[model samples]
Target chain A: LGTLAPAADTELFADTLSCELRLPAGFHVTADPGSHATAETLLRSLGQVEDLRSEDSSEERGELPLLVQRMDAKLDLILALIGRLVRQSDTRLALGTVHWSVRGIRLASPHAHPPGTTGSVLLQPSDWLPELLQLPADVLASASDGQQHWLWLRFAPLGTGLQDALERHLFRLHRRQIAD
Target chain B: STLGTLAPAADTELFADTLSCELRLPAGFHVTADPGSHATAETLLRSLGQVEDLRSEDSSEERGELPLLVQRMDAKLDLILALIGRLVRQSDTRLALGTVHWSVRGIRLASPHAHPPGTTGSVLLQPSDWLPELLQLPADVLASASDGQQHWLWLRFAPLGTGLQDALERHLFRLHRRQIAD
Candidate 1:
């Protein structure tokens, strides 16, 4: 919190909307497309939630009946509870800043992966909803300054639809920071 | 649906999705005139379904595992967490256990103490046997009966909002799906 975000973060995320927040992140170097479709489905659901939440809180908000708001409240509670449960289950979650955007992501890593490596990046998109958003990525660059290694990952073409959904999610994240 | 007779067969009104077995969870009841706040109720409902409903089991050999050093680190963390969990359980309730019939609507359990019909209170139940946290659900005593040595209470839950109710229903369905053939 004291120091500014690293220079790589600024450059990697410059092409699109992005935000740096502390979250559990990991990268697995596997070209296996076996579960990538499932990951995409999961990403779609998360983006859908962001859309619903954002619209509900926007200018269209008014003195609505309790029943109308009740369902959303339930979704909120369930997500929050599941978030805590999933987060607690992982003993290896050493949360650190993740600079994410539609184009790529910049993350601090304990181990370095040389450029041209392909992997899936597992990241908790939102801390409030603790579930991994796995994205297929290629290591664009990686460097270490003694203790901390930094990996800049370029996302593989996530299909036009998924990328658009991710763009919407990033917009909400950026919009959230402005509100803060 | 057949267990070693801890639970009576006649009472198992079939499953609106349920488990009528001895989960042996740490559970208790405290009578109260007022049920509980809505915020607390939502959390209780969600927690009841959270772990089993959504926790993703890791894809084993198909996926490359984390670093061995990380596993070594995780081993230490697990020990600390396990120890802390023990410490918590020791300081917490001295809750006794028995056969419990759980459903989205309410719970029927063998209670040590008897309470009258229409008795309002909170049911403190550990959502998962593995997790020490207890979720509090507001309930009213629907019926109470005794079978010579054991006293039983039929609890009817308070109005859980549509969302919470739906969440609980999904949890029950999952449990039902995983149950072995009777």
Candidate 2:
């Protein structure tokens, strides 16, 4: 099995991409290059969201709770739909076993990264949801047993929100496993 | 005498560049009469440690020799940051650019709002590189002044990890050489 054994304390999920996993031809040694300005802009934008949330008074926020909730749900659905459409135009998803947790991921691949290399993973959940997570991951350990190359990767600073989303996804998968 | 200088250092001169900088005051951070007092700066220092821990491995095994696994991890981080950089650049998000005067030791930037002087905060800078790297350090607000428009904030960075210190020095050196070349 190309699967990694789950840690007792980790929230683990075993799943396969519904679409083919699309990876770049090769991994780069440097992180975001020529994008420090872009990263700066994004950081400021993220702060704006926090600022807006902090500025909103409770009464103002409560004024249209139901309407806001409905709108949020509608937005989520639209985004998910857009994501699926994007995935359709992307490279075909290949079949490979995947085990993931909030902390890290282990997947079967034809290639292997040296033990300490850090790389990126572009995750489009197999389930239909309108989110594509770009994660910076560190290579924890790797090995090949003459079959599939098992790569172990630990998530590096995925930011707070995306980490939460991964946790939720892993929890959902765990629940599904229990039910099975 | 520099009227408002606080612990002036050799590398505090202004060096502007289009790099990413993020600052926040962790909840428990505070200032003490003795700025060097371990307790006063511990909160921010600990937060810095937490940030470092989140992004780097402190495992004893990794400390000895460069393991194949660790190299792969660094490569992955590079790939991820690069991909995310592309995504961020292409996204429709737009923000008004702000003026910044920066160096290895401190930074001054235009802010829409003000941070009270003497407040302690954490600063993260993603500098330009063949592979992008993030440098995080502790900061203390030195001053804030408004010039009829945006508020200007001056912040002095605390001691940095050796890695970040060296990176900052390299970045500044490059900027200085470019200026001389031009």
Candidate 3:
């Protein structure tokens, strides 16, 4: 609850600064009866694989003592390999900037879904710092900009851990931009 | 094996006393009893879930120059892991500061509690340092004994990923050299 926007009233936070990343993106939506259910199940398994957690408490816990334990190198290897695989499989190789926050993302798309379209988004993190995360999203709004269509989509409910990771990344990016 | 044996035979081995950490089964015996199927699945799922956060923390360390290029690369490897530790959100279970006789072959540690000699489980060992890193490996209990006050378990690590094996070897070698130097 602390890091997430209210599920019913996400539009109220339009004023918050959204972080941007440039990379290839793709999405497909279906109006079929079971599409949403299929998307939900797929997202659940993916979220579990990423062990999504949603709290943003990094600053508060900075003073705690560091604990050393055995590190799982295989986990590191899997995420790196997954990130590389997503990059290679993404059909849209052209790089473009995407403005995003924990609430939603604004990006240019060749095919735009009207408001309320449910689908899955494949994101390739351009920085190579973190692995690409796929999230189920709903098209909130969209508009055509001369050549490309700009789609504004809100992410479905995210686990606390995933929310924390995204918020931390956005916060870091915002700070880096301000410093530059 | 004696209760206080420092390390396994390999020259790369060292006592884990320096890191101040211990290894244990997070979910315990039910999952470990049939580690071949259940453990494999659990490890994959758990590994996938935490890997991103792991890398996020490790990538933060500043890579400074060292005396030799190869030595610098080794330092870089440790930095990579340390940063990964930074990304990991602290877990609920706190590992008591303790030492384990460790090497690429096996790990021997003392636990106040006792487990059966044939018990098999995944050992999730967290290292103590600034960027707390974690090591998870499947282990089979080879022997267990107690001297009224403490219970010691000898663990033989099952086959692991090539990358992890290499990293552990390097880690052990570093620890071994540090012990020799001291």
Candidate 4:
């Protein structure tokens, strides 16, 4: 049959039309940092996902796939953060400032030693995120033409309370290092 | 027991010695970028059984021993100088020597800030410090450069030493501040 089909929706009929359709109640997942739960819940309700308020009396109450799916996505993201902290403890990589280069966020020279020296520990980012975040719009627009960005949130000197949030998050995930 | 007390002349004598040693290459070996020149020198040195700064082992079958000492020293010093040059010449972001992410608290000590504070200056180093040092050295001293601040220095024999590397590092640290990225 040497025939071509027209793509115009007007020419198409419901029974003749076919697509790889996802289920009507397909799950949508979004994760947020734990401190952001209230805002996240509000956003989720605004989307297609059903709120738990009507679940009590409804037949679909016990099978609320959307609610279960969203909660699972959030927990999975948290577990991933926990995994990073566990991995941090078992490795020879120490916690502190690793090498910093303009192109690379940090470089940890494995053989470079004497803990206080620049070369000692391996470089790693501070924390894993609950959801991917975009680079700031101002930074994106105005950076030098060839500059690259690193995912790690860099604080100049790690002394003040500003960097303390990262340290506390890492500690909660069990990435306990000697307090520097 | 302590060695004889340092007379007032001790400081003068010590400075005189290292300063004189600074420019002169030890005789018997010569410097060239070519590996052939380096190889021939090492082969010649191997024939002279015992050397003080360099050490080697001999084989029973042939008195014709290979010069391990000179070769090893050349390999290490070559890498060190290359690293030092990279440290000075390249931006902190992409340097082969190290990263630019350390905490320094000064921006006005030895040189003026090349970039305004809290910009890319907050992340990478400005390579403007190498020019003055390069212009001051003797014309005969062999130096090659790639990127703006990166340079390779050679004399008749050895590469630039630890002292020069230390000086360059200090110069960089004095002018920069290690601030959090905004």
Q: 3 or 4, which is superior by TM-score? A: 3
Q: Tens-digit lDDT track for model 3 on A1-180?
A: 112223323562466657766776655574422222222223232333322223352223333223311122344464466545444533444467777777777677787677888876656543443333466788877676567777777777755545655566567567757866
What digit string (tens of lDDT, one per residue) describes model 3 on residues B13-107? 22343332223322221225434433443344344334322323333332365322233223334434433443453334554555566666666
Q: For model 1, how does the per-residue alpha-carbon lDDT over A1-180 read when each residue is reduced to its tens digit?
A: 212335545556765677777888877788753344345445555544555554445434433555645654554555555446545655445688877888888788779888899988878775555455678888877876556777888888876556665777778778878887
lDDT of 3 at B97: 54
TM-score of chain B of 4: 0.18
On the 0 to 100 scale, the lDDT of residue B17 in model 3 is 36
Clashing pairs in 1: none
Error of 2 at B17 (Å): 21
Interface RMSD of structure candidate 3 (Å): 15.4
Query: Which parts of model 4 have CA positions greater than 4 angstroms off?
Result: A1-109, A119-157, A175-180, B1-182
Is candidate 2 or 4 superior in DockQ? 2
Q: Which ten residues in a row have the lowest lDDT in candidate 2 chain A?
A: A17-26
Cα displacement (angstroms), candidate 1, residue B97, comes to 42
Highest TM-score among the candidates is held by which one?
1
Q: Give each model's whole-structure lDDT.
A: 0.63, 0.46, 0.51, 0.24
Model 3 ranges with Cα > 4 A deviation: A1-13, A30-93, B1-182
Per-residue CA lDDT of candidate 4, range B15-131, in tens? 322211111111111122332332333332232222111211221112244543323233333223322433343333321222221111111111121222122111112233221
- The segments of candidate 2 whose C-alpha lies over 4 angstroms from its true place after superposition are A2-77, A157-165, B1-182
Worst 10 residues of 1 chain B by lDDT: B54-63
